[PDB]
Design a protein around this nucleic acid. Structure first.
Ligand SMILES: [Mg+2]
Lengths: 681, 105
DNA sequence: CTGGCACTGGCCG
DNA sequence: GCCAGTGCCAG
């Protein structure tokens, strides 16, 4: 086993030069430094470990180091270098699995101070290394009277960079051993720093293998990117901007501008008493100024006017002119109450709630102002679309790369439950086809927007989703109590009508609304009541669905004892610990984690089966994973025939996953072929 | 004797009126404005011959103030034949106001 | 329930 | 530039 790390001149997307590398070999217990002219030797040493059937450890190597080395080897040495997945270990992936209850900076992409909770120390240091190096570099320059430039610290190799490279490996080795000391994931009887790759994967908890396979595949997905229709979104932006302006024109006509105190530095005191009046707006008391100018003549010596507008001692209140801003909840509240609106619910900070739900219920006398509320709701929605697609810091138009694709990031295990998190931009929050402008947004993301590198023909999209996964996971867990009754109902008959009767509900739709919310630990807005009838709905449901009550009880007795815990985690499907934040959300944690691990193994198995059938993963091949959104995947396919194969293979993989973990409820998928995400919903 | 203006009557009561017109732009939430209020009542009586005193509440009449670039209140604008002759911002005292009017009338 | 992120508005150098 | 406060979009 060896531990390594490299320093190069840029992020993966544009890296062109290997600066240095460091390798720690457990067999010799020594560190070896490789400078720029040693690139070839660096690569040979890694390949020697692979030839021994060994293991190579990187921190974030799955997303950066490994892919960067392949790229750099070809560019600089015209050499083909491809480290196999089975020979690589990533301490960042391991940390995210073992310390899943904690956040991390995502290697410095996120500000430490903004994250909640504590941070694992070694991982914190590794993620802050670039920032520290840049600080050491900068002060060394300014001390020499040299100006610093944007990011010159990475243009050339230098010895302090080499030192940081050595330090990274020292800390990564420390992190590694800290992670390997967790006996829940690594049996104490085995020294994992002294075994071949096959032993490492087979002797460690199943979750270790699944998380590395997921990170390897998802790094590939990020590299693939999601083909994006830039032109279509620029046109949507023009359309949205035009509607925004018109709404503003109307609203600023209906709600006029006004003045607000601003710039006051002095406290206003009662002229009579002198007692401070904190409530009154701050004032300003001019020290200089008068009616006449200080004279220059015998006529005046016993006078010219002071055109200045202030008089020493005469206080005034500084004010600023403000125009109605439809995005400001404060302005909205100000104007509507002035129209007669009387708030019914405020925030913990005293401010009145101004969300879509309350706005919809606001009633004022003036018909123009009443109708203006619809304009405000529309304006707020338009702003949300404009921010996400064009103006926001993470707008789609700001992220589209030269290859015409958006390469959103994915943290394979960013959520406590085992779900992945998506960001930069978050491709798991694109407006759905049923929401305003959703069809245009969704249509802009699609395989059709990628033209084949050889034929120039657009690719086709296969959209596959797991069917009612959450409910099937519930059926699985209640099977030890109902012997598969709930499961049998799901795939044979109607489970929603079954729950409707169970919870004395009027509409079947109310059932679906009730169930997907009962699992979220939630109220009566389903029927129209609230905080009264709701209590009666739960008791009635649980009463007619004894198996769910049994499941809840069993979960509780496992975690709580009185909050005083007996164990604050649940065992996931692959054996990992899944932190339980609250006793009431325990069932949701169990269900969401089950679905997450199922979908994770599913996408891994699906790609492996496609590869075993002879299909090549990549734009230079047959298919390309473009997005994974919890229970669905969108895959680009060179041809429709391939798309049909991907759809059929994904079903086989899901059935394989259900059998693999002896699931008590049959698992299924549904797939659609089309040109983009709008059609493949 | 004080004229209470509105955005719609401003043009005719001020800009197209004869004689000197002192306009006070104020707001209910301003401390200084409340200070000078009493003073203005007494000024309207004294100069009852050669001066008309008017008030414009900027909250109830949001259209006018912006046209004169109000930056603070109370703002006193002395109009003469449809135009601003003199301007002073702040809670002037009885005496100070007197001198202002005298020196500008 | 688990997440990301856009806007406004206050404080700051 | 930041930190909160609020709200909404996804699953
Ligand atoms: Mg590194």
């Amino acid at each position: 086993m060896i531990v390594s790390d490299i320093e190069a001149n840029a992020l993966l997307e544009s890296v062109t030069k290997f600066h240095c590398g460091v390798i720690y070999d457990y067999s010799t217990a020594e560190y070896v430094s490789y400078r720029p002219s040693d690139f070839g030797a660096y690569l040979d040493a890694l390949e020697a470990e692979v030839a021994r059937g060994g293991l190579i450890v990187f921190h974030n190597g799955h997303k950066y180091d490994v892919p960067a080395l392949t790229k750099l080897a070809k560019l600089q040495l015209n050499r083909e270098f491809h480290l196999p997945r089975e020979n690589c270990i990533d301490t960042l992936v391991l940390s995210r699995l073992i310390h899943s209850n904690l956040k991390d900076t995502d290697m410095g992409l996120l500000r430490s101070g903004k994250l909640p909770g504590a941070l694992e120390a070694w991982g914190y240091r590794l993620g802050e290394m670039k920032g520290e190096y840049k600080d050491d570099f900068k002060r060394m320059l300014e001390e020499q009277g040299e100006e610093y430039v944007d990011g010159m610290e990475w243009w050339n190799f230098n010895e302090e960079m080499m030192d940081y490279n050595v330090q990274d490996v020292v800390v990564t080795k420390a992190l590694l051993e800290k992670l390997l000391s967790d006996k829940h994931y690594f049996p104490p009887e085995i020294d994992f720093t002294d075994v071949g790759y096959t032993t490492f994967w087979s002797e460690s908890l199943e979750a270790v293998d699944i998380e590395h396979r997921a990170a390897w595949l998802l790094a590939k997905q990020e590299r693939n990117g999601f083909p994006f229709d830039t032109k279509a979104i620029e046109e949507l932006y023009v359309e949205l901007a035009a509607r925004r302006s018109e709404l503003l024109r109307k609203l600023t006509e209906t709600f006029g501008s006004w003045y607000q105190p601003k710039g006051g530095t002095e406290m206003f005191c009662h002229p009579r008493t002198g007692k401070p009046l904190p409530k009154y707006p701050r004032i300003k008391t001019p020290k200089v100024g008068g009616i006449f100018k200080k004279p220059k003549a015998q006529r005046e010596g016993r006078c010219e006017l002071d055109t200045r507008e202030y008089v020493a001692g005469a206080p005034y209140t500084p004010v600023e002119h403000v125009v109605f801003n439809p995005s400001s909840r404060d302005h909205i509240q100000k104007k509507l109450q002035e129209a007669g609106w009387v708030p019914t619910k405020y925030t913990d900070k005293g401010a009145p709630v101004v969300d879509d739900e309350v706005l919809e219920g606001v009633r004022v006398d003036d018909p123009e102002k009443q109708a203006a509320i619809d304009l405000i709701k529309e304006y707020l929605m338009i702003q949300k679309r404009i921010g996400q697609s064009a103006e926001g810091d993470k707008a789609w138009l700001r992220y589209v790369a030269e290859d015409g694709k958006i390469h959103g990031s994915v943290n394979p295990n960013g959520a406590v439950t085992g779900r992945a998190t998506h960001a930069f931009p978050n491709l798991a929050q694109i407006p759905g086809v049923r929401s305003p402008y959703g069809e245009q947004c969704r249509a802009a993301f699609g395989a059709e927007h990628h033209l084949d590198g050889i034929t120039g023909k657009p690719w086709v999209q296969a959209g596959i989703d797991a069917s009612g996964l959450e409910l099937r996971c519930l059926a699985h867990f209640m099977a030890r109590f109902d012997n598969g009754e709930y499961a049998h109902e799901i795939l044979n008959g109607d489970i929603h009508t079954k729950n409707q009767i169970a919870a004395e509900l009027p509409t079947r739709d109310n059932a679906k609304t009730f169930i997907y919310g009962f699992l979220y630990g939630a109220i009566g807005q389903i029927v129209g009541a609230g905080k009264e009838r709701g209590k009666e709905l739960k008791k009635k449901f649980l009463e007619n669905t004894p198996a769910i009550a049994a499941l809840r009880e069993s979960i509780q007795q496992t975690l709580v004892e009185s909050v005083k815990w007996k164990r604050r985690w649940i065992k996931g499907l692959d054996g990992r610990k899944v932190h339980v934040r609250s006793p009431h959300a325990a069932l949701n944690t169990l269900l969401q984690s089950a679905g997450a691990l199922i979908c994770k193994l599913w996408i891994i198995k699906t790609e492996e089966m496609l590869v075993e059938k002879g299909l090549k993963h990549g734009w230079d091949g047959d298919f390309a994973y473009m997005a994974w959104v919890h229970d669905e995947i969108q895959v680009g396919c060179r041809t429709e025939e391939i798309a049909q194969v991907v759809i059929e293979t994904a079903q086989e993989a899901m059935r394989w996953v259900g059998d693999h973990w002896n699931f008590r409820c049959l698992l299924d998928t549904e797939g659609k072929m089309g040109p983009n995400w709008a059609i493949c919903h | 004797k004080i004229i209470h203006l509105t955005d719609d009557s401003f043009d005719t009561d001020v800009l197209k009126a004869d004689g000197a017109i002192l306009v006070d732009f104020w707001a209910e939430w301003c401390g200084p404005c409340k200070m000078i209020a009493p003073i203005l009542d007494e000024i309207a009586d004294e100069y009852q011959g050669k001066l008309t005193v008017a008030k414009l509440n900027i909250d109830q009449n949001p259209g006018t103030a912006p046209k004169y670039g109000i930056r603070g209140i109370p703002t006193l604008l002395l109009f003469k034949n449809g135009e601003v002759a003199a301007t002073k911002v702040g809670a002037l005292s009885k005496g100070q106001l007197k001198e202002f009017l005298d020196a500008n009338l």
